[PDB]
Structure formats: structure tokens, C-alpha cells
Design a protein around this motif. Structure first.
Motif, PDB file in Angstrom:
ATOM      1  N   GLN A  66      -1.488  -9.606  -5.594  1.00  0.00           N
ATOM      2  CA  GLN A  66      -2.124 -10.822  -5.100  1.00  0.00           C
ATOM      3  C   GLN A  66      -2.406 -10.800  -3.597  1.00  0.00           C
ATOM      4  OE1 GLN A  66      -3.061 -11.775  -8.251  1.00  0.00           O
ATOM      5  NE2 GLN A  66      -3.031 -13.829  -7.341  1.00  0.00           N
ATOM      6  N   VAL A  67      -2.091  -9.691  -2.928  1.00  0.00           N
ATOM      7  CA  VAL A  67      -2.230  -9.588  -1.472  1.00  0.00           C
ATOM      8  C   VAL A  67      -3.386  -8.662  -1.100  1.00  0.00           C
ATOM      9  CG1 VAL A  67      -1.143  -8.930   0.688  1.00  0.00           C
ATOM     10  CG2 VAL A  67       0.235  -9.982  -1.144  1.00  0.00           C
ATOM     11  N   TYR A  68      -4.329  -9.190  -0.335  1.00  0.00           N
ATOM     12  CA  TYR A  68      -5.453  -8.437   0.199  1.00  0.00           C
ATOM     13  C   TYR A  68      -5.227  -8.242   1.690  1.00  0.00           C
ATOM     14  CZ  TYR A  68     -10.272  -7.291   1.530  1.00  0.00           C
ATOM     15  OH  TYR A  68     -11.404  -6.670   2.041  1.00  0.00           O
ATOM     16  N   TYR A  69      -5.083  -6.993   2.106  1.00  0.00           N
ATOM     17  CA  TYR A  69      -4.782  -6.669   3.495  1.00  0.00           C
ATOM     18  C   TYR A  69      -4.981  -5.178   3.653  1.00  0.00           C
ATOM     19  CZ  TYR A  69      -2.398  -7.278   8.052  1.00  0.00           C
ATOM     20  OH  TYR A  69      -2.090  -7.359   9.406  1.00  0.00           O
ATOM     21  N   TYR A  70      -4.783  -4.646   4.852  1.00  0.00           N
ATOM     22  CA  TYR A  70      -4.812  -3.195   4.927  1.00  0.00           C
ATOM     23  C   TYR A  70      -3.515  -2.669   4.304  1.00  0.00           C
ATOM     24  CZ  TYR A  70      -2.371  -3.918   9.477  1.00  0.00           C
ATOM     25  OH  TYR A  70      -1.518  -4.311  10.485  1.00  0.00           O
ATOM     26  N   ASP A  82     -11.343  -1.638  -0.649  1.00  0.00           N
ATOM     27  CA  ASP A  82     -12.504  -2.505  -0.522  1.00  0.00           C
ATOM     28  C   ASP A  82     -13.374  -2.074   0.673  1.00  0.00           C
ATOM     29  OD1 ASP A  82     -14.128  -4.709  -1.227  1.00  0.00           O
ATOM     30  OD2 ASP A  82     -13.085  -6.011   0.198  1.00  0.00           O
ATOM     31  N   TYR A  83     -12.775  -2.063   1.862  1.00  0.00           N
ATOM     32  CA  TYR A  83     -13.417  -1.601   3.094  1.00  0.00           C
ATOM     33  C   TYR A  83     -12.447  -0.819   3.947  1.00  0.00           C
ATOM     34  CZ  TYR A  83     -17.612  -4.446   2.540  1.00  0.00           C
ATOM     35  OH  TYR A  83     -18.793  -4.983   2.088  1.00  0.00           O
ATOM     36  N   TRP A 117      -6.764  -4.686  -2.326  1.00  0.00           N
ATOM     37  CA  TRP A 117      -5.794  -5.477  -3.069  1.00  0.00           C
ATOM     38  C   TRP A 117      -4.549  -4.685  -3.416  1.00  0.00           C
ATOM     39  CZ3 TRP A 117      -6.185 -10.597  -3.456  1.00  0.00           C
ATOM     40  CH2 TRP A 117      -7.449 -11.182  -3.301  1.00  0.00           C
ATOM     41  N   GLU A 121     -16.842  -1.553  10.144  1.00  0.00           N
ATOM     42  CA  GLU A 121     -16.287  -1.196   8.845  1.00  0.00           C
ATOM     43  C   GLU A 121     -17.280  -0.426   8.000  1.00  0.00           C
ATOM     44  OE1 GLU A 121     -15.171  -5.015   7.410  1.00  0.00           O
ATOM     45  OE2 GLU A 121     -17.135  -5.471   6.548  1.00  0.00           O
ATOM     46  N   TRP A 149      -8.473  -1.581   3.788  1.00  0.00           N
ATOM     47  CA  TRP A 149      -8.320  -2.931   3.258  1.00  0.00           C
ATOM     48  C   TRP A 149      -8.559  -2.962   1.764  1.00  0.00           C
ATOM     49  CZ3 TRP A 149      -7.564  -7.803   5.778  1.00  0.00           C
ATOM     50  CH2 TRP A 149      -7.334  -7.700   7.150  1.00  0.00           C
TER      51      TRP A 149
END
Ligand SMILES: Nc1nc2c(ncn2[C@@H]2O[C@H](COP(=O)(O)OP(=O)(O)O)[C@@H](O)[C@H]2O)c(=O)[nH]1
Ligand SMILES: [Mg+2]
Lengths: 92, 168
Positions: free
Chosen positions: A77-81, A29-30, A74, A46, A72
Motif C-alpha cells: 500500500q506504500v508508493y515511494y522510492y 513506476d518512475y 508500489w 524523471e 519510485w
């Protein structure tokens, strides 16, 4: 494994850096980029996940900096780095 | 005791599903009752990344926002799930004040915490994933979408918080 991989300074001036990295196969994503003097706050910005380069400006000449890139996105269900963020040290 | 134990505190506006998430995680069923009994703590032995451990889930449902009891839950807690419902915009707007409260109670800018967008089984959401993604990225914390009803993401949310506690 590092995500992204092969972080490097590809061009520089006394006060600036151009960094590049290799995107993973997964959708990012970023990318969040942090940088601070290795002799320790950290600055952060970013770029969209469709990009895998950045510039860092306004640095002190002749000073060691620690630069870290976070991917960063998905993972189910987890969005994080994702994976392990990659870091380099560099002095202009 | 001697077995590794993680104290996980669930916070968020009334009605977002703190209790439902907790009961789904621990007891593997979905609760939608008019007047349920909510325990002050739920415990269960699980394995997370090969580690046998006890989770102690501390649900803050029913407490007044500024009560000493709420403060006590925050002080004893090791990590926090900040829960909103994806079909309730006000509950998402409330997240900021919960995070700031936890930071002040811990007297720290870096407290183990995850953002949880619950009720992800529902059709017509009002908070888009994008909004929560950007918020979590600005906080530097994980975001998990969950359904206490279907169990989608539920283990992810709590186990991700355990991982944040470990690396604190
Ligand atoms: N469809 C759906 N309903 C939920 C979910 N989580 C909670 N609920 C319902 O939302 C209402 C409030 O949940 P509750 O756990 O009591 O919220 P709390 O006040 O935050 O503890 C109840 O009707 C629950 O059944 C979910 O993930 N999906
Ligand atoms: Mg309720």
C-alpha cells in the motif's frame, strides 16, 4: 540493498553524461534522477520505469557531480522510492 | 518521558477519515457514528522496525483551519499525515494548502510528511492512484492508500511517517 543497482556513466562529453543502471525485479513506476555539484540546489528529472538509462546535459566541464537515482514504485500500500537510492560521483 | 515517542499529526478536510484512521490504528475498530467522542491525543506502545516506541496521534478534527489550536498542533507535531478521501475530489484539491501551511509553520521546505488516500475499501473512487502518485513524487514524500474500515494500509501509513521522522 541499492535500488536500482550498478549506476554508471557509460558515455560522456565535457558538458554531458549518459548514465545507465540495472532495473530491479519489481515494477518501477518512475526513476527520479537528481544531480548537483558535489561542492554544494540539486536538479531533478524523471524517466518512466520501463527505461533504465538517461542523459544529463548542461553541465560545467571539469566539475564533480553527485548523481542519484531513486526507484519510485508500489510496495503493498506504500508508493515511494524503494530500497536505498544509488549514487555515484563523476567529473567530466 | 524517556521512552522514544513520536508525535504524529493528522490533517485533511473534514470527513476524510482522520478520526477513523486514528481510532482504527490505536483501538483496532472502525467508527462510523453521528456524534463520537474524539480525544485530543491517542497514545499506544508499538514496535516499528524493532523499536519499541510511543505513538502520540494528534487528530486535528474539529479545529478551525486557521485557529491558534490548529497552529499549536502543527508546531508541536514531528510529522504529518495529509489525508484525503479517494472518493472526494475536493479533499484531494485541499491537500496543497495543508502542505503549504505545515511548511510555513515549521519554516521549512522539508517537514516529515506522508500523503494518505483513505477509504480505499470503497468501490467508485474519484481520485485515481495515478494522480496521487504523481503528486507525492513531485513532493518527494510517500503515498499510502488506507482504509480505516478494513485496516488495510493503516499501520503502513503511520509507520512510514515514523520512518520519515527518523531520517529527517
Ligand atoms: N468506507 C470508509 N469509510 C470511512 C473511512 N474512514 C472514515 N470513514 C467514514 O467517513 C466519515 C468521516 O470520518 P471521520 O473519521 O469522522 O473524518 P474526519 O472529519 O476527517 O475526522 C465517517 O462516516 C467514517 O465512518 C474508510 O476508510 N472507509
Ligand atoms: Mg467528520
Amino acid at each position: 540493498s541499492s535500488v536500482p543497482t550498478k549506476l554508471e556513466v557509460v558515455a560522456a562529453t565535457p558538458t554531458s553524461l549518459l548514465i545507465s543502471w540495472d532495473a530491479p525485479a519489481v515494477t518501477v513506476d518512475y526513476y527520479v534522477i537528481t544531480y548537483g555539484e558535489t561542492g554544494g540546489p540539486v536538479q531533478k528529472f524523471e524517466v518512466p520505469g520501463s527505461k533504465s538509462t538517461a542523459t544529463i546535459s548542461g553541465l560545467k566541464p571539469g566539475v564533480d557531480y553527485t548523481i542519484t537515482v531513486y526507484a519510485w514504485g508500489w510496495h503493498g500500500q506504500v508508493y515511494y522510492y524503494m530500497g536505498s537510492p544509488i549514487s555515484i560521483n563523476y567529473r567530466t | 518521558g524517556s521512552m522514544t515517542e513520536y508525535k504524529l499529526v493528522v490533517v485533511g478536510a473534514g470527513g476524510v477519515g482522520k478520526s477513523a484512521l486514528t481510532i482504527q490504528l490505536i483501538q483496532n475498530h472502525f467508527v462510523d457514528e453521528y456524534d463520537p467522542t474524539i480525544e485530543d491525543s491517542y497514545r499506544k506502545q508499538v514496535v516499528i522496525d524493532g523499536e519499541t516506541c510511543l505513538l502520540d496521534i494528534l487528530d486535528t478534527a474539529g479545529q478551525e483551519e486557521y485557529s491558534a489550536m490548529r497552529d499549536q498542533y502543527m508546531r508541536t507535531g514531528e510529522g504529518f499525515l495529509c489525508v484525503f478521501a479517494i472518493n472526494n475530489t475536493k479533499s484531494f484539491e485541499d491537500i496543497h494548502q495543508y502542505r503549504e501551511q505545515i511548511k510555513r509553520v515549521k519554516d521549512s521546505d522539508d517537514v516529515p510528511m506522508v500523503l494518505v488516500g483513505n477509504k480505499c475499501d470503497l468501490a467508485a473512487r474519484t481520485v485515481e492512484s495515478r494522480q496521487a502518485q504523481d503528486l507525492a513524487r513531485s513532493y518527494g514524500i510517500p503515498y499510502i492508500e488506507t482504509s480505516a474500515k478494513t485496516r488495510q494500509g493503516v499501520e503502513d501509513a503511520f509507520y512510514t511517517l515514523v520512518r520519515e521522522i527518523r531520517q529527517h
